[PDB]
Design a protein around this motif. Structure first.
Motif, mmCIF file in Angstrom:
data_model
loop_
_atom_site.group_PDB
_atom_site.id
_atom_site.type_symbol
_atom_site.label_atom_id
_atom_site.label_comp_id
_atom_site.label_asym_id
_atom_site.label_seq_id
_atom_site.Cartn_x
_atom_site.Cartn_y
_atom_site.Cartn_z
ATOM 1 N N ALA A 1 33.659 58.345 25.129
ATOM 2 C CA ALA A 1 34.653 57.295 24.949
ATOM 3 C C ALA A 1 35.887 57.520 25.811
ATOM 4 C CB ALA A 1 35.031 57.162 23.487
ATOM 5 N N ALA A 2 36.344 58.766 25.898
ATOM 6 C CA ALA A 2 37.479 59.094 26.754
ATOM 7 C C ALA A 2 37.236 58.678 28.210
ATOM 8 C CB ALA A 2 37.807 60.564 26.666
ATOM 9 N N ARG A 3 36.027 58.936 28.710
ATOM 10 C CA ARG A 3 35.667 58.586 30.081
ATOM 11 C C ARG A 3 35.561 57.068 30.257
ATOM 12 N NH1 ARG A 3 35.214 60.217 35.640
ATOM 13 N NH2 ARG A 3 34.066 58.460 36.555
ATOM 14 N N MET A 4 34.936 56.402 29.290
ATOM 15 C CA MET A 4 34.861 54.947 29.308
ATOM 16 C C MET A 4 36.246 54.316 29.421
ATOM 17 S SD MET A 4 31.787 53.769 26.810
ATOM 18 C CE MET A 4 31.683 55.290 25.888
ATOM 19 N N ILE A 5 37.220 54.898 28.722
ATOM 20 C CA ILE A 5 38.607 54.452 28.806
ATOM 21 C C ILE A 5 39.111 54.587 30.246
ATOM 22 C CG2 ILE A 5 40.982 54.855 28.034
ATOM 23 C CD1 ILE A 5 39.602 55.958 25.365
ATOM 24 N N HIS A 6 38.926 55.772 30.824
ATOM 25 C CA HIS A 6 39.342 56.051 32.197
ATOM 26 C C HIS A 6 38.847 55.016 33.217
ATOM 27 C CE1 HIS A 6 40.224 58.425 35.837
ATOM 28 N NE2 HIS A 6 39.042 57.994 36.241
ATOM 29 N N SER A 7 37.559 54.683 33.142
ATOM 30 C CA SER A 7 36.943 53.734 34.062
ATOM 31 C C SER A 7 37.467 52.324 33.846
ATOM 32 C CB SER A 7 35.427 53.745 33.893
ATOM 33 O OG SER A 7 34.890 54.970 34.350
ATOM 34 N N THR A 8 37.509 51.922 32.581
ATOM 35 C CA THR A 8 37.963 50.604 32.183
ATOM 36 C C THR A 8 39.430 50.382 32.547
ATOM 37 O OG1 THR A 8 36.409 50.838 30.345
ATOM 38 C CG2 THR A 8 37.870 48.945 30.301
ATOM 39 N N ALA A 9 40.283 51.357 32.239
ATOM 40 C CA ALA A 9 41.695 51.262 32.588
ATOM 41 C C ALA A 9 41.819 51.006 34.079
ATOM 42 C CB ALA A 9 42.436 52.521 32.197
ATOM 43 N N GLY A 10 41.235 51.900 34.874
ATOM 44 C CA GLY A 10 41.230 51.791 36.330
ATOM 45 C C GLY A 10 40.686 50.476 36.861
ATOM 46 N N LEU A 11 39.581 50.000 36.283
ATOM 47 C CA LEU A 11 38.972 48.751 36.738
ATOM 48 C C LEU A 11 39.872 47.550 36.473
ATOM 49 C CD1 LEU A 11 36.812 46.857 37.896
ATOM 50 C CD2 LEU A 11 35.547 47.074 35.765
ATOM 51 N N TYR A 12 40.296 47.374 35.221
ATOM 52 C CA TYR A 12 41.119 46.218 34.866
ATOM 53 C C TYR A 12 42.489 46.280 35.520
ATOM 54 C CZ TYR A 12 37.619 45.582 31.112
ATOM 55 O OH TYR A 12 36.461 45.443 30.385
ATOM 56 N N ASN A 13 43.036 47.487 35.664
ATOM 57 C CA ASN A 13 44.294 47.669 36.385
ATOM 58 C C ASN A 13 44.247 47.145 37.813
ATOM 59 O OD1 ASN A 13 45.372 50.555 34.558
ATOM 60 N ND2 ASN A 13 46.451 48.587 34.733
ATOM 61 N N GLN A 14 43.145 47.398 38.518
ATOM 62 C CA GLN A 14 43.005 46.899 39.887
ATOM 63 C C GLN A 14 42.734 45.391 39.899
ATOM 64 O OE1 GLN A 14 38.699 48.189 41.787
ATOM 65 N NE2 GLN A 14 40.072 46.813 42.915
ATOM 66 N N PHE A 15 42.042 44.908 38.867
ATOM 67 C CA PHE A 15 41.779 43.479 38.709
ATOM 68 C C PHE A 15 43.084 42.723 38.474
ATOM 69 C CE2 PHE A 15 41.207 39.919 35.753
ATOM 70 C CZ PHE A 15 40.349 39.096 36.474
ATOM 71 N N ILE A 16 44.020 43.379 37.791
ATOM 72 C CA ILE A 16 45.364 42.847 37.582
ATOM 73 C C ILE A 16 46.151 42.836 38.895
ATOM 74 C CG2 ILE A 16 47.636 43.415 36.566
ATOM 75 C CD1 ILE A 16 46.042 44.127 33.953
ATOM 76 N N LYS A 17 46.088 43.940 39.641
ATOM 77 C CA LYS A 17 46.768 44.048 40.936
ATOM 78 C C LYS A 17 46.319 42.952 41.902
ATOM 79 N N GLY A 18 45.059 42.538 41.775
ATOM 80 C CA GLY A 18 44.521 41.431 42.559
ATOM 81 C C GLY A 18 45.142 40.097 42.186
ATOM 82 N N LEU A 19 45.425 39.921 40.899
ATOM 83 C CA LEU A 19 46.053 38.701 40.408
ATOM 84 C C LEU A 19 47.529 38.637 40.786
ATOM 85 C CD1 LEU A 19 43.360 38.122 39.174
ATOM 86 C CD2 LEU A 19 44.385 38.387 36.910
ATOM 87 N N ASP A 20 48.240 39.746 40.586
ATOM 88 C CA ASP A 20 49.648 39.854 40.965
ATOM 89 C C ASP A 20 49.859 39.566 42.442
ATOM 90 O OD1 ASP A 20 51.183 42.435 38.835
ATOM 91 O OD2 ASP A 20 50.209 40.514 38.364
ATOM 92 N N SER A 21 48.902 40.001 43.261
ATOM 93 C CA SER A 21 48.981 39.854 44.712
ATOM 94 C C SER A 21 49.065 38.398 45.172
ATOM 95 C CB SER A 21 47.816 40.571 45.410
ATOM 96 O OG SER A 21 46.568 39.960 45.114
ATOM 97 N N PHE A 22 48.314 37.507 44.526
ATOM 98 C CA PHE A 22 48.283 36.105 44.957
ATOM 99 C C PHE A 22 48.953 35.111 44.000
ATOM 100 C CE2 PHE A 22 43.703 35.717 43.160
ATOM 101 C CZ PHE A 22 44.189 35.332 41.915
ATOM 102 N N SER A 23 49.790 35.627 43.099
ATOM 103 C CA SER A 23 50.473 34.813 42.088
ATOM 104 C C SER A 23 51.238 33.627 42.684
ATOM 105 C CB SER A 23 51.422 35.681 41.258
ATOM 106 O OG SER A 23 52.403 36.284 42.085
ATOM 107 N N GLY A 24 51.990 33.884 43.752
ATOM 108 C CA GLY A 24 52.778 32.845 44.412
ATOM 109 C C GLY A 24 52.230 32.405 45.759
ATOM 110 N N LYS A 25 51.008 32.829 46.075
ATOM 111 C CA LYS A 25 50.386 32.531 47.367
ATOM 112 C C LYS A 25 49.132 31.658 47.234
ATOM 113 N N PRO A 26 49.146 30.467 47.870
ATOM 114 C CA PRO A 26 47.988 29.577 47.903
ATOM 115 C C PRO A 26 47.400 29.358 49.304
ATOM 116 C CG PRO A 26 50.075 28.336 47.700
ATOM 117 C CD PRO A 26 50.373 29.728 48.210
#
Length: 485
Positions: A356-381
């Protein structure tokens, strides 16, 4: 020297990169991503490799006659010509040949269940030095053949990155031992554990803390049962890394969920450090029987350190500084002289929690980068690196089934036991701020009214999965919060 079943092994191959041999290990995450990839292990001195997800267990080793028979219906030694079954230590999934591509080549990934011919692999000699029916020995080059597809376990080079697939071409593979028969109740490398002081254990701050999660503490109460207090012991040797720990033997101490490395640093002091900044001098520790002044074997070695029963002083190798505290939660520091009561004892983490600890590590990292992708194009079309759409969907689906409650039709006794596990699985994720993490994905996604509106700011290709991901996120959110009592 012979390989026996139940051994823990990594599958290593080699490649030439700019006139030098990089060694690579077969690796997969399982959850969120079935496909195998290759983990460079050559630069270990400077950057510790992600070894946890490289480990496989040799479940069974069968003859053609034996295999063909099982498909219709403790320590056998590996013989060339045998078919082997390799279970992923982390995901408990089996190494298999898939039916997807990218050339006439299959993908190499993980399979949920050892069903059918797909997860079986036959072993063949590299040279005339060894022959079919003979004991497979340390250091041998191996050819591995997919039973399902008659193809070879193969290192690929296209266009430019290293990759694994099943090819008509062949790749020479070394099967390196990690650990063998282990002395019961003894500390070995690659074990995930907690370090107790005196109750108080060695930990980092909870999620979204002012720390930035970089500082180390001794803390009591609930931490001792939380994922943040878990560490992985990593000796500075890829092979026999899973051997018994020895007093004075250097190792790295990795924080599981955060994936960072206990280190001594010039500016900050005793902290936790990114994999990339984890050079040997900064990050090498050892256990010491005492604080008095003061050749490596090729086996499991002598068992020296006992779980719970052994008291150990932790020392930074380069500086000879002691792991101690500053005079509930106290700050962990490195000090020349330290304290008369610095000795810790070790308790082994159990597999469910460890996983479970490892699953957390992977999931945190994955969704965190998925968020960074959203933040990147928030004001850009877009220039924004592709969102991990494919991985997120699977990650979501996997965690949903992971948190699924037991069927109501199950017997009372089994129900109760299954519920406790579910509740505790949930507990670990919640304490690591998985709820907020899921919520942020939802909030950033919901800025958008529909798929088309989303598409305006993101590829039309990305937009085709927007409703699914949002629905999957809510479902996961619900699965996390559910009481299951």
């Amino acid at each position: 020297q012979f390989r026996r079943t139940d051994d823990e092994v990594v599958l290593q191959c080699s490649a030439t990169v700019l006139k030098e041999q990089l060694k690579l290990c077969l690796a997969a995450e399982g959850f969120g991503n079935r496909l195998c990839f290759l983990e460079p292990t050559s630069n270990a001195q400077n950057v510790p490799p992600d070894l946890a997800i490289c480990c496989f267990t040799l479940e069974q080793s069968l003859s053609v006659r034996a295999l063909q028979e099982m498909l219709a219906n403790g320590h056998r030694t590996l013989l060339y010509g045998h078919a082997i079954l390799l279970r992923h230590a982390h995901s408990r999934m089996y190494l298999s040949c898939l039916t997807t591509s990218r050339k006439l080549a299959f993908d190499v990934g993980l399979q949920e269940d050892a069903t059918g011919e797909a997860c079986w692999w036959t072993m063949h000699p590299a040279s005339k030095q060894r022959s079919e029916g003979e004991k497979v020995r340390v250091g041998d080059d191996l050819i591995l053949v997919s039973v399902s597809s008659e193809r070879y376990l193969h290192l690929s080079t296209a266009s430019g990155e290293l990759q694994v697939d099943a090819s008509f071409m062949q790749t020479l593979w070394n099967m390196n031992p990690i650990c063998s028969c282990c002395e019961e109740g003894y500390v070995t490398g690659g074990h995930v554990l907690r370090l107790f002081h005196g109750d108080e254990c060695l930990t980092i701050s909870a999620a979204d803390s002012d720390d930035q999660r970089r500082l180390v503490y001794y803390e009591g109460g609930a931490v001792c049962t939380h994922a943040r207090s878990l560490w992985r012991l990593e000796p500075l040797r890829i092979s026999w890394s899973g051997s018994h720990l020895r007093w004075g033997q250097p190792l790295r101490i990795r924080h599981v969920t955060t994936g960072r490395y206990l280190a001594l640093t010039e500016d900050q002091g005793l902290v936790v450090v990114d994999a990339c900044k984890a050079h040997t001098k900064a990050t090498s520790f050892c256990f010491r029987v005492s604080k008095e002044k003061l050749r490596d074997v090729e086996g499991m070695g002598p068992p020296e350190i006992k779980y719970g029963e052994s008291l150990c002083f932790v020392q930074h190798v380069a500086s000879g500084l002691w792991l101690t505290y500053a005079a509930l939660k106290k700050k962990a520091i490195l000090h020349q002289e330290g304290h008369m009561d610095d000795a810790l004892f070790l308790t082994r983490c159990q597999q469910e929690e460890s996983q479970a600890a490892r699953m957390i590590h992977s999931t945190a990292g994955l969704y965190n980068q998925f968020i960074k992708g959203l933040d990147s194009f928030s004001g850009k079309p877009p220039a924004g690196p592709a969102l991990p759409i494919e991985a997120v969907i699977l990650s979501l689906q996997d965690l949903i089934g992971y948190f699924e409650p037991p069927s109501e039709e199950l017997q009372h006794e089994e129900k109760q036991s299954k519920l406790r596990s579910l509740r505790n699985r949930q507990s670990l994720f919640q304490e690591e701020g998985m709820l907020s993490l899921v919520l942020n994905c939802i909030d950033r996604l919901n800025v958008y009214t529909t798929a088309a509106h989303f598409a305006e700011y993101a590829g039309e290709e990305a937009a085709e999965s927007w409703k699914e991901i949002v629905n999957l996120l809510y479902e996961l959110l619900a699965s996390l919060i559910r009481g299951n009592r």
